[PDB]
Symmetry: C2
């Protein structure tokens, strides 16, 4: 369903570009952004992201997720708490500008924290001789390039449910590179040949559309 | 050879941390930055990154690479221009705050442009259900993860010279999962089994240190 974004910045703008076709509500105090927000395809809700009543009129309750990106560390936390007073289920992803705050966001109830500068800093250190690593990260994330990164859940009653990674041989079968498996908020990279896929497991891979579609079929569940 | 970082920020700080144990010169206008920098193990140079004299003062000429991240893209660009007047060959990596300025930074002379907000925004859109992709990206770029991404060049006369991907059997042989090959200006992700390696090629892989070492010895 719908996604709510609290605040506005270059990150959320790029995020909207990726969420077009999806119903998105942007709640922010700076009306100067209404134009850009509306152009970007999102519904603009003028209001205070740290206020429960405004979060509510922004349709936070029942949202699929709420992305929080406010300049103030304090406001981000107050926003998180406000969201939590409305809906305890909704996934909350918060942007952090300082490493020192990542845990306070966690404490407040954020399910995930994205730190643009940690990522930027590491790409800088990895780009001293060439930019292949930076290129990788950018390519696999560029919505529609030769090969892209995707995640596919292993549905209940999946064809591979109970099968081993070795027995699966997903790469030779589909052509998709398996970079990891997500299970219970934990990512297992390059799992042992004896790792057995289970429903709910999330497969992270890199491949072409055809290869991806092939993976979807290979992971489909045996049900009418 | 040393590395110069122009500007001070959370990004350059994380970079500085990842470069622990290497000679680094940080050039910035605020003396306050001094202490915070000297600690992290970097040498501080009090000066203006947009001023050529101060850039020279920071030892840019001859540097292994120059990382640029100033207040605005305008200043960043001014810095790059400054660096190019000194060393037209030194590698320049610059952070861009806006997608619109990327081209300008490149034109000014930046060899590479990092747009943290474009990456972050993309991760945001991919974390609506879970954060595995975001988790993947931040872990692999960490030089301290158990399984991290690494670059390994094919040395001259390598035994992998002219050998196809298939015949190299690198994953089974070392345990390192190969994600791509860096050759020239292009990056080939998941090269076809019929891809022949060459000296100079850069192999991008992911694995534990042990797996990494096996790949290094195997490529000799």
């Amino acid at each position: 369903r719908h996604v709510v974004i609290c605040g506005w910045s270059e990150s959320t703008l790029e995020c909207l570009r990726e969420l077009r076709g999806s119903e998105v509500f942007v709640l922010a105090e700076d009306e100067n952004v209404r134009k850009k927000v509306l152009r970007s395809g999102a519904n603009f809700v003028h209001g205070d992201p740290t206020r429960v009543s405004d979060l509510e009129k922004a349709n936070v309750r029942g949202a699929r997720a709420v992305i929080v990106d406010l300049e103030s560390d304090s406001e981000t936390i107050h926003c998180i708490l406000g969201i939590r007073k409305i809906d305890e289920s909704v996934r909350i992803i918060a942007e952090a500008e300082r490493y020192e705050n990542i845990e306070q966001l966690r404490m407040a109830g954020a399910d995930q924290v994205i730190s643009p500068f940690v990522i930027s800093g590491r790409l800088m250190s990895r780009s001293i001789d060439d930019g292949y690593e930076a290129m990788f990260v950018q390519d696999v994330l560029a919505e529609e390039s030769t090969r892209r990164m995707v995640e596919v859940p292993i549905p209940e009653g999946s064809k591979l449910e109970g099968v081993s990674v070795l027995d699966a041989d997903i790469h030779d079968v589909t052509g998709v590179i398996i970079i990891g498996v997500g299970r219970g908020d934990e990512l297992i990279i390059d799992p042992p040949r004896d790792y057995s896929f289970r429903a709910g497991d999330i497969i992270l891979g890199i491949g072409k559309p055809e290869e991806i579609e092939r993976l979807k079929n290979y992971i489909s569940a045996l049900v009418p």
